[PDB]
Coordinates of C-alpha atoms (C1' of nucleotides) and ligand atoms in Angstrom, one line a residue:
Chain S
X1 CA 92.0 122.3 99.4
X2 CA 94.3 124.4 101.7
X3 CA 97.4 126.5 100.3
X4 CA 96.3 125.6 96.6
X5 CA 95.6 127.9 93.4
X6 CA 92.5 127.8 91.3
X7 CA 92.9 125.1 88.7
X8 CA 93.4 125.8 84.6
X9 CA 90.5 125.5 82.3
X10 CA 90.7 121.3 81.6
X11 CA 93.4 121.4 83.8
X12 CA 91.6 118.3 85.7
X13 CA 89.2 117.3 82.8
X14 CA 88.2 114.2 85.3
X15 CA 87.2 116.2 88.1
X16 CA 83.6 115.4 89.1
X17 CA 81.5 116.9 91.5
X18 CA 78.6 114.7 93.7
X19 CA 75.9 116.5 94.5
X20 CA 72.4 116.2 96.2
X21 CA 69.0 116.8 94.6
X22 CA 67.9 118.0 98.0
X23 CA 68.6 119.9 99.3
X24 CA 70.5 121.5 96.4
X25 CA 73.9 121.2 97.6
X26 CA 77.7 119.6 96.9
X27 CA 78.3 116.8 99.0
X28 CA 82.2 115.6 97.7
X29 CA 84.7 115.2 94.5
X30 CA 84.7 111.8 92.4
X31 CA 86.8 111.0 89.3
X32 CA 85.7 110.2 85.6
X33 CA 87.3 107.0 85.1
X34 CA 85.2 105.8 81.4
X35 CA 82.3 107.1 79.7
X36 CA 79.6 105.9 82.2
X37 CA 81.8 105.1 85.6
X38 CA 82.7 107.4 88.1
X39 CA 85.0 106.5 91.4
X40 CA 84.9 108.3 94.9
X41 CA 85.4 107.8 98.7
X42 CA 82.7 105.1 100.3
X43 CA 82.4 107.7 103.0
X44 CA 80.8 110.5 100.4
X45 CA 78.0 107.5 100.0
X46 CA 78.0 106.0 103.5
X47 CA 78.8 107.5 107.0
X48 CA 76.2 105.8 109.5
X49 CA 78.0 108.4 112.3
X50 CA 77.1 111.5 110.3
X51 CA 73.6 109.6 109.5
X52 CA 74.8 109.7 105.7
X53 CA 73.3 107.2 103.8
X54 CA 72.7 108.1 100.4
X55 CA 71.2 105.7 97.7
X56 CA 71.3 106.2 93.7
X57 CA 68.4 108.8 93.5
X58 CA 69.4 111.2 95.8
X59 CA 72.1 112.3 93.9
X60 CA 73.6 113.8 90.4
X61 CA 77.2 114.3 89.0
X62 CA 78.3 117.3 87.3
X63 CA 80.9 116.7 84.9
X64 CA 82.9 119.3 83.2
X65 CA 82.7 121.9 86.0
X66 CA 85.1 124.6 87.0
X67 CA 83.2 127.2 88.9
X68 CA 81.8 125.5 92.1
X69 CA 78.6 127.4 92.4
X70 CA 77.8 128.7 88.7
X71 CA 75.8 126.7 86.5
X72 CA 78.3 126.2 83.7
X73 CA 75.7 125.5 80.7
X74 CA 77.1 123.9 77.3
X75 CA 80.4 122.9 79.7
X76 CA 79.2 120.9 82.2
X77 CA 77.4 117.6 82.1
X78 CA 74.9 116.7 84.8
X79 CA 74.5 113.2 85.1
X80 CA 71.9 110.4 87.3
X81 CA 73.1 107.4 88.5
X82 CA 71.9 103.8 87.9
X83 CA 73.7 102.2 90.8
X84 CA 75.7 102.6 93.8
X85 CA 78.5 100.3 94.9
X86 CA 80.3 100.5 98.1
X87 CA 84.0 98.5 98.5
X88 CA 82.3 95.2 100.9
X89 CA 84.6 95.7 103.7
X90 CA 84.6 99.1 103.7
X91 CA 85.2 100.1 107.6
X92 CA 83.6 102.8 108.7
X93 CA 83.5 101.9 112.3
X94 CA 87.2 102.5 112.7
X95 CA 89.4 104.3 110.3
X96 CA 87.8 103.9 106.8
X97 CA 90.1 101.7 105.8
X98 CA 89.1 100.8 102.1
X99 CA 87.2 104.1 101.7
X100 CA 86.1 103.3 98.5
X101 CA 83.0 103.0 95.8
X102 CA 81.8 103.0 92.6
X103 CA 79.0 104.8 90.6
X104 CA 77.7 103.9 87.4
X105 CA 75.8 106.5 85.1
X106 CA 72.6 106.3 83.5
X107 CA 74.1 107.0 80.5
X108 CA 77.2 107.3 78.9
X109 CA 78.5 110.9 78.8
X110 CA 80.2 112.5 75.8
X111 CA 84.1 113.1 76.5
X112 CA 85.1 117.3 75.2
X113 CA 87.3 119.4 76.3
X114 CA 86.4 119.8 80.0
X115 CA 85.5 116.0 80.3
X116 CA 87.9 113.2 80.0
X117 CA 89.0 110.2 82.1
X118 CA 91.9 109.5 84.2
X119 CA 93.9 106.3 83.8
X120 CA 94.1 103.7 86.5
X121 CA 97.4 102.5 87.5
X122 CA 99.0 98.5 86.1
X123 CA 100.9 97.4 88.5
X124 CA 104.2 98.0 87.1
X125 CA 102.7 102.3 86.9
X126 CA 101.9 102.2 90.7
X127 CA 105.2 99.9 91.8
X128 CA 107.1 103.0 90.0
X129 CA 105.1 106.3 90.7
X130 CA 104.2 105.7 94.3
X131 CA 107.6 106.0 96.2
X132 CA 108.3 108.7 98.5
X133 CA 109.6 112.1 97.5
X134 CA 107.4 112.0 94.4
X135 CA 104.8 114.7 93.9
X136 CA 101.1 113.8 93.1
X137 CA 98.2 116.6 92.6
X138 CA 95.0 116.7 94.3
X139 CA 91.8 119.3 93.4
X140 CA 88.6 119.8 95.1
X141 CA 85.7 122.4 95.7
X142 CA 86.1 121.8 99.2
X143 CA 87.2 123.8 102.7
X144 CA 90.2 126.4 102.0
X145 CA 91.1 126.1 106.0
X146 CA 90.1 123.1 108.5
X147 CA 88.2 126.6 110.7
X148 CA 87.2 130.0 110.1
X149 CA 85.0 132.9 110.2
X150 CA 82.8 133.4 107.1
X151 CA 82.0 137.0 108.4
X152 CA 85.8 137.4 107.6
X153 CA 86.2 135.7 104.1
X154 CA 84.3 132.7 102.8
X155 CA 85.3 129.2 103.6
X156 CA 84.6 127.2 100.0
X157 CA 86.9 128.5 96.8
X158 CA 85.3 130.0 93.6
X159 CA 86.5 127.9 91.6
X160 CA 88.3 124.4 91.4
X161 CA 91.4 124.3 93.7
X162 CA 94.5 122.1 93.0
X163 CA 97.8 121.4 94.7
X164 CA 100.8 119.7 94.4
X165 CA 101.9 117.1 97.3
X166 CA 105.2 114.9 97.7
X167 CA 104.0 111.2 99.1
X168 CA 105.6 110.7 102.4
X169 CA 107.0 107.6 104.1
X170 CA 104.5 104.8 105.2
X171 CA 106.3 104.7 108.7
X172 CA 106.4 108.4 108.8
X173 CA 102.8 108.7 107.7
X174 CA 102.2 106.2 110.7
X175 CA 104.3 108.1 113.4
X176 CA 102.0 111.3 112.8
X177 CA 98.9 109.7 114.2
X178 CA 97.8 107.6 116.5
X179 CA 95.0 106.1 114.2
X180 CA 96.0 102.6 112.3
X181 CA 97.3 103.5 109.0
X182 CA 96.4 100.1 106.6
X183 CA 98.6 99.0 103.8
X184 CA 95.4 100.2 101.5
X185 CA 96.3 104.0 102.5
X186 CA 98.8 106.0 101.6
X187 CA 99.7 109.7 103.0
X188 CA 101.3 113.0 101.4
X189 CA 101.9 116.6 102.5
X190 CA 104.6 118.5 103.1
X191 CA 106.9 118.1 106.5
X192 CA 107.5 121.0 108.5
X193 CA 110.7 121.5 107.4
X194 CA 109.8 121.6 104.2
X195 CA 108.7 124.7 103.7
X196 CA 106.1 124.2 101.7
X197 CA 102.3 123.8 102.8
X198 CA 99.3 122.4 101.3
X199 CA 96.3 119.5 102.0
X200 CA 93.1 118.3 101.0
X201 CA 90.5 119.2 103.5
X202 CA 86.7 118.3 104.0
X203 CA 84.7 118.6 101.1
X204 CA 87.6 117.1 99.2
X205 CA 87.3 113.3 99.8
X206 CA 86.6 111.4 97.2
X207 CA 88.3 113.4 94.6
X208 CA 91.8 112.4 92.9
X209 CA 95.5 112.1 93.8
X210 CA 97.1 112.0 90.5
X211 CA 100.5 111.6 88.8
X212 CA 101.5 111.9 85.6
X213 CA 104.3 109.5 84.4
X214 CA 107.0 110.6 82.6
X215 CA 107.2 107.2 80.4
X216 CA 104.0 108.0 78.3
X217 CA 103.0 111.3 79.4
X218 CA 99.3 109.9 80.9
X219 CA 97.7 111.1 84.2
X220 CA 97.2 108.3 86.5
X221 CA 94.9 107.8 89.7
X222 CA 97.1 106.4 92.4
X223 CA 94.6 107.9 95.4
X224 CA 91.3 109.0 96.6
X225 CA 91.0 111.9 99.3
X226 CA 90.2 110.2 102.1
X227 CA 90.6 111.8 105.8
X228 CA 93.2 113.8 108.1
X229 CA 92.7 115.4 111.2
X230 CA 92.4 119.0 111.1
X231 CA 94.3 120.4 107.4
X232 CA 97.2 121.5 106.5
X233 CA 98.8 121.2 110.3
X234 CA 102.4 120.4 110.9
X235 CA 103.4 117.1 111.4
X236 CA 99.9 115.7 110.3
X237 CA 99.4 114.4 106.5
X238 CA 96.1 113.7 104.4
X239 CA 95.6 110.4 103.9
X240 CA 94.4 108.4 101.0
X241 CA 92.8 105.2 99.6
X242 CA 95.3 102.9 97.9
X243 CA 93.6 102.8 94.1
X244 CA 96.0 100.0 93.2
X245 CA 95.8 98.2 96.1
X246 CA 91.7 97.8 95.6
X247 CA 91.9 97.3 91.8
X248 CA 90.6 93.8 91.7
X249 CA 87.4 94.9 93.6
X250 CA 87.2 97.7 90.9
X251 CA 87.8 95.5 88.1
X252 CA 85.4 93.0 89.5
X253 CA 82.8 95.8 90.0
X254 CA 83.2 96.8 86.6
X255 CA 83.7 93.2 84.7
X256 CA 80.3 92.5 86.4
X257 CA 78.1 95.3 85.5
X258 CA 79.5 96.6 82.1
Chain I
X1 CA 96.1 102.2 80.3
X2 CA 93.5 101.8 77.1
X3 CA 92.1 104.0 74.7
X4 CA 93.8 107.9 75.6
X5 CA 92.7 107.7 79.4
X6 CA 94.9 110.5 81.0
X7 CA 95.9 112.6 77.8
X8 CA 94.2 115.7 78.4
X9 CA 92.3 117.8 75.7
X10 CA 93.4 121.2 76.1
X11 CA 97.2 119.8 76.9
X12 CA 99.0 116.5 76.2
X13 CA 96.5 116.5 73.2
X14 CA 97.4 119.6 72.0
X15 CA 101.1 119.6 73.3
X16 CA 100.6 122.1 75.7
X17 CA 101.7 121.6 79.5
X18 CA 99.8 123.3 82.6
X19 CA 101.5 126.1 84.8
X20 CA 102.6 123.5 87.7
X21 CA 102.9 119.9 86.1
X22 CA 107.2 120.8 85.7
X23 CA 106.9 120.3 89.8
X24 CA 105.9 116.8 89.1
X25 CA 108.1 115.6 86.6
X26 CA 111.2 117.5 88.4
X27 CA 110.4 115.5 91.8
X28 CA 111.0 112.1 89.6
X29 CA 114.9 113.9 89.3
X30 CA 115.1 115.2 93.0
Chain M
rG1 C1' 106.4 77.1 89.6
rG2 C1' 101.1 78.4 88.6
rG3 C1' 96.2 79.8 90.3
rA4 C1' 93.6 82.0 94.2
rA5 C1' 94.2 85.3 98.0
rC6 C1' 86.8 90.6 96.5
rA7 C1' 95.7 93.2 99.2
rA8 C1' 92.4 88.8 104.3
rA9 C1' 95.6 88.5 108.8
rG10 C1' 100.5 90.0 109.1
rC11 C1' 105.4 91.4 108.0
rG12 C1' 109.9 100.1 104.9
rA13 C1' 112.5 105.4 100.5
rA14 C1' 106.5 98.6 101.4
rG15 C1' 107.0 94.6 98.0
rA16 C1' 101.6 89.2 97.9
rC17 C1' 107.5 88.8 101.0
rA18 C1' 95.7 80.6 105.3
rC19 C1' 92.9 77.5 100.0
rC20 C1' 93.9 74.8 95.3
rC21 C1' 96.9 72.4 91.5
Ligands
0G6_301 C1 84.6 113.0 103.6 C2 85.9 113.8 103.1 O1 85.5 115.0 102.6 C3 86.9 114.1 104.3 C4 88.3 114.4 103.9 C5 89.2 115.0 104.9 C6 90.6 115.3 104.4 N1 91.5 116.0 105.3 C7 92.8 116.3 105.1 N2 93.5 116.9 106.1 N3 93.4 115.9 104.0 N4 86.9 112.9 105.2 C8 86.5 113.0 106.5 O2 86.0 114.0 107.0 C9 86.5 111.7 107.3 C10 85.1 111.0 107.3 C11 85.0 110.4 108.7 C12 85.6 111.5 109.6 N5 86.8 111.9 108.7 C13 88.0 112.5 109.1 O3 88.8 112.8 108.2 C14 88.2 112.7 110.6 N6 88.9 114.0 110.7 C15 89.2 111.6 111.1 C16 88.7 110.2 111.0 C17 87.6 109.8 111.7 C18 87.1 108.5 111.6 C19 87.7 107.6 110.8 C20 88.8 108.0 110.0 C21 89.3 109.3 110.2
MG302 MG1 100.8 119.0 107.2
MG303 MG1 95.2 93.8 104.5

RNA sequence: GGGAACAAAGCGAAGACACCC
């Protein structure tokens, strides 16, 4: 996350972190959505280009976390993973359009006070909240600047970053790049005239874009972190997957395999 | 959505709001 | 009108605007 501030204890009680049994290291962000389902970006999973290809043992999510290094014992939750399910016409080859997947848990994790799922929009919730002009938030452990020079300051945050976005006009979103921007993405960022700065960046994809309605008060996932080019430049936005527009996949996913 | 998905813990649950969430709600005005 | 359309191909402050009944 560029131009962000370090998140509030349970401030993001969804927030989960995928990470590799070996080498020991983070590999994306991921969102609780129930007791024993987590969501994230296909990409995180699958990236034939980057030779990423990761199956159910390879990896663990750690639930509950704050610190992105620290071993937060009695906080976190470190959980396995039964099965791996990546959206069926995910595409990869172009521009990750339906960069999406599903991981269910070995086991069903207690919810606390640092662990608690996010709500998935009806389509009435997403029909209101997504409109232009409206803020979401996204969080990640991931790069605080798209390059730098570690021997000047570290790259990674300490601890969880979040930031607040306004979504941006589909035809604007598609007149800042040249890549084909499908109706299951979305974009947000600030505009240069704007003033205000702020993006995901890599290390950040698969975590959440949330809103919280006003009507109820509930914390809704309308997107995943999905790509950009470059972070945080001006004229350029990060992109997202569409969570509403995929919901029957996730439903079926789900209705499927409990 | 079902059950209390989205209500967190440590704030809608204990009526408490986070330092930034007003930027939200205001952009629903503006 | 309804279902289906694993929001598939397409079409603006984006809003299901070829299969089945
Ligand atoms: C995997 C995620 O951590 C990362 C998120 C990038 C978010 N950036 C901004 N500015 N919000 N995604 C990526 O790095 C993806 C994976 C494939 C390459 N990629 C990119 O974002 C490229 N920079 C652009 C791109 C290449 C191929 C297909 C789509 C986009
Ligand atoms: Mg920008
Ligand atoms: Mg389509």
């Amino acid at each position: 996350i560029v131009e962000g501030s370090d998140a509030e204890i349970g401030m993001s009680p969804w927030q989960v972190m995928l990470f590799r049994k070996s080498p020991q290291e983070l590999l994306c962000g991921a969102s609780l959505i129930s007791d024993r389902w987590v969501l994230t970006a296909a990409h995180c999973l699958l990236y034939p280009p980057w030779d990423k290809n990761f199956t159910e043992n390879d990896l663990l999510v750690r639930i509950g976390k704050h610190s992105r290094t620290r071993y937060e014992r009695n906080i976190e939750k470190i959980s396995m993973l039964e099965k791996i399910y990546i959206h069926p016409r995910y595409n990869w080859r172009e521009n990750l359009d339906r960069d999406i997947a599903l991981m269910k848990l070995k086991k069903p994790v207690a919810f606390s006070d640092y662990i608690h799922p996010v709500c998935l929009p009806d389509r009435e919730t997403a029909a209101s909240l997504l409109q232009a002009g409206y803020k979401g938030r996204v969080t990640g452990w991931g790069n605080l600047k798209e390059t730098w020079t570690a021997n000047v300051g570290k790259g990674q945050p300490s601890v969880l970053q979040v930031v607040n976005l306004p979504i941006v006009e589909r035809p604007v979103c598609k007149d800042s790049t040249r890549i084909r921007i499908t109706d299951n993405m979305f974009c947000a960022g600030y505009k240069p005239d704007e003033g205000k700065r702020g993006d995901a960046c890599e290390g950040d994809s698969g975590g959440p874009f949330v809103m919280k309605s006003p009507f109820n008060n509930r914390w809704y996932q309308m997107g995943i972190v999905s790509w950009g080019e470059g972070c945080d430049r001006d004229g350029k936005y990060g992109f997202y997957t569409h969570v509403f527009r995929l919901k029957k996949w996730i439903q079926k996913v789900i209705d499927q395999f409990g | 959505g079902e059950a209390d998905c989205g209500l967190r813990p440590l704030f809608e649950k204990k009526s408490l709001e986070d330092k930034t969430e007003r930027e939200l709600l205001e952009s629903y005005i503006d």
